[PDB]
Every structure is written in structure tokens, then in C-alpha cells.
Amino acid sequence: SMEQVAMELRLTELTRLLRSVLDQLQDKDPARIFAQPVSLKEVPDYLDHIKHPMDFATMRKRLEAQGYKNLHEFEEDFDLIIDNCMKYNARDTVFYRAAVRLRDQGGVVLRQARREVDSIG
Template identity: 35%
Template sequence: MRLPKTDIDEVQSTLKAVLTKLKAHESAWPFAKPVDAAEVPEYYGHIKFPIDLKTMGDRLKQRYYVHPHLFKADMRRMYHNCCQFNAEDTEYFKAGRALNEYFEQLWTEHGFVA
């Protein structure tokens, strides 16, 4: 991945802006927080590496994302988990696809490449 941004603070700021926009997207609601095991008890038996927008926000605050590819990897994992757990005709799958498409658009708009 070629990254034009070199200042870690600038990268963190940009990732925060991307995450804020993702959280505000109309299709973000299924991904806003971790899946509740009481509501969906089988989820954690199928999904070994869960991720959600809240956890990504926590990771951003902890400066876990020392390189943008880590952020993108979490987004890809979230989408993969969604596709793996939900059928294509569900509102969750459709929301995941829409949010992923929006993410890819934001990623490019904010100057990240591949």
C-alpha cells in the first residue's frame, strides 16, 4: 500500500474523520456496537474475530492504528463477518454491503491508496 500521509497524527486525524462518517451512515446501525451474545447467542460460535465501529473507535483512541492498513483490515473483517454470518437477502447483509461501498469511497477520497 502506498500511503501519501506520513505524519502519524495526520493519519490518526484522517482515520477519525473516516470513522465518524461511517458511524453517521444510514447503513451503520448493525455495526455500531459489538453483537450482543444474549440476543444472538450463536454469533460468537461462528465469528472468531468480531469487530464493530465502537471497537474501532476504541482502537483509534488507543492509537492501535499505527498504519492505515490496520484500520482497513478491521473494516474488511467487519464486512467479511457480516457476509459470513448473514444471508444475502437480509437487511444486515445489505447494510454491510452499503457500508463497505461507502467505506471504499471514503478511503479513496481521503487520499489512501489500495
């Protein structure tokens, strides 16, 4: 149908906007701490602690399959990156501190993303 096409164009355009959001958030992680999944070879107990691992590569895979229907779903995944790190790692670690800085800096980017998503529809 023509409606299904129009819906698909909307999803494509959301995917375009989320790709730019993802790039801007990942720039706030210059150490690449959150770039890839925590290695289960290197942290073999990880899944005993963290039930839903997340990282920027995993988000990018979902994004490119157009697997984010709305901004809320994308934000859920970004918040998992931060929140998983802040639980597994202690306050006095470079990992925890990296997550706090990513959260704080990312907030700005996400605030305007929400306005753009609503504005453009």
C-alpha cells in the same frame, strides 16, 4: 528523543485523519447496524461462527488509544465488520444488505484516504 516525538506527532496526525475517515464511514450506516458489538447475550452462538468480531465502537476505542499504526490496519478492521456480517447473515436480510451498501459507499472514502495518507506521508 526528538525522533520519537516526531514519530508520535505523525501517529497523532494519522489518528486525526482516521477519526474523520471513521466518522464518514459510520455515516454510511444510518441504521446503526454496525455501531456496537454483536451481543453474545442475544446471539449466544456468535463466536462459533465469527472468530474475530468487529464493530465501529470497538474501532473507535482502538483509534483513540492511537492503536492504528497505518491505514492498512484500520481497513483490516473495517473489512471485518463487512465480511463478518456477510457470512453470518443471509443475502436476503437487512443486515447483509446493509453491509453491501456500507462496503460500496465506504470504498469512495477509503480511496481518497489512501491518497491523503501517501500524499501527507
